[PDB]
Design a protein around this ligand. Sequence first.
Ligand SMILES: N[C@@H](Cc1c[nH]c2ccccc12)C(=O)O
Ligand SMILES: N[C@@H](Cc1c[nH]c2ccccc12)C(=O)O
Ligand SMILES: *[C@@H]1O[C@H](CO)[C@@H](O)[C@H](O)[C@H]1NC(C)=O
Ligand SMILES: *[C@@H]1O[C@H](CO)[C@@H](O)[C@H](O)[C@H]1NC(C)=O
Ligand SMILES: *[C@@H]1O[C@H](CO)[C@@H](O)[C@H](O)[C@H]1NC(C)=O
Ligand SMILES: *[C@@H]1O[C@H](CO)[C@@H](O)[C@H](O)[C@H]1NC(C)=O
Ligand SMILES: *[C@@H]1O[C@H](CO)[C@@H](O)[C@H](O)[C@H]1NC(C)=O
Ligand SMILES: [Ca+2]
Ligand SMILES: [Ca+2]
Ligand SMILES: [Ca+2]
Ligand SMILES: [Ca+2]
Ligand SMILES: [Ca+2]
Ligand SMILES: [Ca+2]
Ligand SMILES: [Ca+2]
Ligand SMILES: [Ca+2]
Lengths: 531, 537
Amino acid sequence: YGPDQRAQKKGDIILGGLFPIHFGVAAKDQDLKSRPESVECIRYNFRGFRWLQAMIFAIEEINSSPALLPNLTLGYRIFDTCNTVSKALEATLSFVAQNKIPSTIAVVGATGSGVSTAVANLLGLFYIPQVSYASSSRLLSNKNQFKSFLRTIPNDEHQATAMADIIEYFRWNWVGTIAADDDYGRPGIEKFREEAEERDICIDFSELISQYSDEEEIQHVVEVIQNSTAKVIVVFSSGPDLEPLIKEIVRRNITGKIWLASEAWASSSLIAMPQYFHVVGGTIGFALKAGQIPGFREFLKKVHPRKSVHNGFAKEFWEETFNCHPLCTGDENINSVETPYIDYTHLRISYNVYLAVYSIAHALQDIYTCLPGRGLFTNGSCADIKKVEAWQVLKHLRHLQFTNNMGEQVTFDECGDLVGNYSIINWHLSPEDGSIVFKEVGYYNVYAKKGERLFINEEKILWSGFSREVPFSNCSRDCLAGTRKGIIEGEPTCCFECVECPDGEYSDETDASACNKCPDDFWSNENHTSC
Amino acid sequence: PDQRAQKKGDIILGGLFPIHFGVAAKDQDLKSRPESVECIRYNFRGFRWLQAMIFAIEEINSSPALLPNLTLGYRIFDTCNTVSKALEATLSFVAQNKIDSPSTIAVVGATGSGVSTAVANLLGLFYIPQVSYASSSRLLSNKNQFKSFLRTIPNDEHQATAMADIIEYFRWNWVGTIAADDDYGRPGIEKFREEAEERDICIDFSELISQYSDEEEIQHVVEVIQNSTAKVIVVFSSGPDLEPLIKEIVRRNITGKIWLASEAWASSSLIAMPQYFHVVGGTIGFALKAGQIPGFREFLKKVHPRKSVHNGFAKEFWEETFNCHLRPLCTGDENINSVETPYIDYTHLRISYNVYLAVYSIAHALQDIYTCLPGRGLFTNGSCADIKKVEAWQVLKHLRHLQFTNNMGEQVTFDECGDLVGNYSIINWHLSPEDGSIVFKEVGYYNVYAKKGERLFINEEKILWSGFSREVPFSNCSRDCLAGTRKGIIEGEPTCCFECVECPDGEYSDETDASACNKCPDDFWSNENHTSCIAKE
Ligand SMILES: N[C@@H](Cc1c[nH]c2ccccc12)C(=O)O
Ligand SMILES: N[C@@H](Cc1c[nH]c2ccccc12)C(=O)O
Ligand SMILES: *[C@@H]1O[C@H](CO)[C@@H](O)[C@H](O)[C@H]1NC(C)=O
Ligand SMILES: *[C@@H]1O[C@H](CO)[C@@H](O)[C@H](O)[C@H]1NC(C)=O
Ligand SMILES: *[C@@H]1O[C@H](CO)[C@@H](O)[C@H](O)[C@H]1NC(C)=O
Ligand SMILES: *[C@@H]1O[C@H](CO)[C@@H](O)[C@H](O)[C@H]1NC(C)=O
Ligand SMILES: *[C@@H]1O[C@H](CO)[C@@H](O)[C@H](O)[C@H]1NC(C)=O
Ligand SMILES: [Ca+2]
Ligand SMILES: [Ca+2]
Ligand SMILES: [Ca+2]
Ligand SMILES: [Ca+2]
Ligand SMILES: [Ca+2]
Ligand SMILES: [Ca+2]
Ligand SMILES: [Ca+2]
Ligand SMILES: [Ca+2]
């Protein structure tokens, strides 16, 4: 059978699903004293449950549309990954059960690049297409490695360049970098490192973090941050991988810092806590272009613990949202409790889930509506939808082109990626609410020419959550007239000494490389300003 | 899989080896149902490592000292240096366990860190211990991720520091970096990057490569190398991942470069080719601690396709050695000594020794299973493991707490991260005068047990730079500032890149590579060359 907690529904064609319904697994690192029992998943993820719902909603919406996959039913087998490779693989082994009892023709998921890579290695083997709604690592664009992998989220390459463009914009040359020690944080900071050095930005420190980092490991990173004159900190990490570090920085009230948030934690409920505002206030981050899902918000509200014969996560959702089953009536209202399930402004990753399901639906439709000699298969033959195999769906998904329910053109490139713009958000505090509000202060247009991609409105930004002045984050303060830039041995190029000009020489303008000799008739003034 | 090395036993040890260097590099049309991909370049060294697992298993079996009561059986598969082929095989090892959604109690392998990580994710799930003889990535030290992973090869962390120590030694400040775009090359160069920056070494370029890189992808890297003033190139890659790049550099006869070889390619048959010597000559690389396995070289010669019934790779080995079929045909009367392949053409057993050591680690862990009596145990209430009903997780707790004495009388133990420390030998790529083949001369050593700064030993006299010159090459961004001049900033370029600005009148510079010029005392004035001061002004 496979895992106990699941969202299952029978159909003619089955779509697998992988969602982080829980943030992690139990802190039980067994001594292996006895036979190891299955680990239990711990922190409930309401946002993750909302994404699971977007898959079901889309599946039901397709099932109701008679012209899309006519006289056919889309079924599903959705599992909880708990943001862990092991739990995800347990589930993936169930999807591939038949391949070496209904077949899984395609899989939606996973979230974390580390989890999606592990799933892709196993699915790729059986040519089952995988459509991830959130895994953005550049490593997943390698089609020699990931033969059946596609995604409805852009690759992080431009996001890391956008970081370096923002730094170049506000004219900062002294930054620090923090990355989650996974297939997401590591390639993201590496691309950023490359782009910052192109734009002559010096990186003072480059540290690694994880959700399972020691008190010792966290201490070292906090010390590195404190012992650094760099105020700009670039962070390529997820919420769970960053939470241990942020908790400690909040505890020590380290307030100077101006955080540059990667898309994974820029909208994380684990970091966007009002208690952390003294530390995380005025964070500049990335958000994906938001999409529209009409009727979805209504569908979310219809969730009932008893009703969901199909959704086995509906009981646990009810229990966590109402500190329930104390006991539940079942007649409880979901508008009353404030959880990220309904407490959202824009559907971004949820939209990517919706878009992922529709990509598979449209790929299956192209097989179905195929005309004798216009097929993608041998001699121009068409596949039989009644006898459809996963590899056939993959062939179609590879260079799929379809029109969005918003009327927009959706296409996957040669690396199975979607290209998308980014919205730039700033972490403000709502005066009335008291909660962290994500104000859209700019955008990053990836279609624009290099140097014309970034748009920022400085006026909408609240530095450190309060300040209205762009902070200083250069290694050394600029050399004034009468002085020249001097090298500091062991320190990088944008760390300089301001050496006073020698007698007979002058420094007319600010940040001079050397002083100019006065013409033979004249001599330097009292402080070498000019002669 | 069809092609395997199987033998029944009481306890089965899984095996993963790169019998082939890669798979048919082709985009599946997907016009037709995808068939099993074809593995392509035969790996004789890989086959010799597979043999070290069988030899060790047979040596344990014959010997009464170890498990006289039990027979060690095996199920060995070819990975073809690919995640997919390795996972196909791993799915077979876990076949019995998988039913919850013939037991394999432990697995030997794989080689590539990318392959071992994929295998580890699947094995770790079922707590089947995995002992890799060659996967050296630091990423595999993470015990939250890799619960059942252990290795008989050290972690690359000190190897990358050793690179930076060698560069610091020869006083070079301008280098380039090349890494295989995998879980091996990437963390190795990243650690090197940290260490080089701590020793004030500037990296001009940082490029990525792969065995499946485009003609365009390779061309970009060769252009980057050519357009760079850096002569020292640090390469963290395997032979297969580096071969496409080296082939092109040889084709363009780019000879200036001085290569710093990662342990994976420092002894690679694919790179250590005599037609590449103009390019790869005088390469400074790393080799692990060697080992001798008595009777192994005679065991290697005993291979026949009809006789070796258990080894299904013998047929293909035979065919690729004598260039025959089982285009001319093979005779069961062919002699092994006649054909010269890397199977017998080896000098030291290093990775082969790690395979031998990996099998013995599992053997000694199982041996500690019988010797157990209630009280001497680690389980339940001091409980022990029933060697007749042994489960893989039981072998794993024993392997974690494993301490045993080696074939060379050395203590073998695993870290809390399943690692084992080891020193490195530093080799140099020389040419045999008579033979014309690439000889690996041991020019130094790296002692990991020594204090920081005292770990490296090198004999410059034994090194032949570029394969010929005895002069340590220049590889700094800018030539040193002589007396009379001071160091000046270059706005775009890093700190290693400086201008040598002439001292002003009334000032001088006593020393080479000065930050600023010193003012002469009032009685004196600047020298003709600004190197000192002369009296009367
Ligand atoms: N992009 C991240 C994961 C991620 C992106 N956005 C998110 C929002 C919430 C949770 C996780 C994410 C990765 O591929 O690893
Ligand atoms: N250490 C490399 C593989 C490797 C080391 N030595 C080798 C010799 C031959 C072939 C491969 C190797 C890795 O972890 O990926
Ligand atoms: C439509 O579906 C029903 C139920 O699955 C089936 O009985 C009928 O034969 C199908 N029609 C076609 C055209 O296949
Ligand atoms: C910081 O450095 C950049 C580049 O050197 C420069 O343009 C900027 O003006 C400096 N910052 C200040 C404080 O002026
Ligand atoms: C944190 O520091 C800031 C500035 O020093 C200050 O405004 C704030 O009140 C401090 N927080 C606490 C815990 O008082
Ligand atoms: C990206 O933004 C630009 C301008 O803001 C727009 O022209 C483009 O349509 C947007 N992205 C997409 C999905 O095309
Ligand atoms: C090169 O490298 C360092 C500077 O970082 C220095 O010790 C050495 O003397 C330099 N000079 C030359 C010409 O090698
Ligand atoms: Ca329908
Ligand atoms: Ca997930
Ligand atoms: Ca620069
Ligand atoms: Ca979150
Ligand atoms: Ca330095
Ligand atoms: Ca025996
Ligand atoms: Ca291998
Ligand atoms: Ca090799």
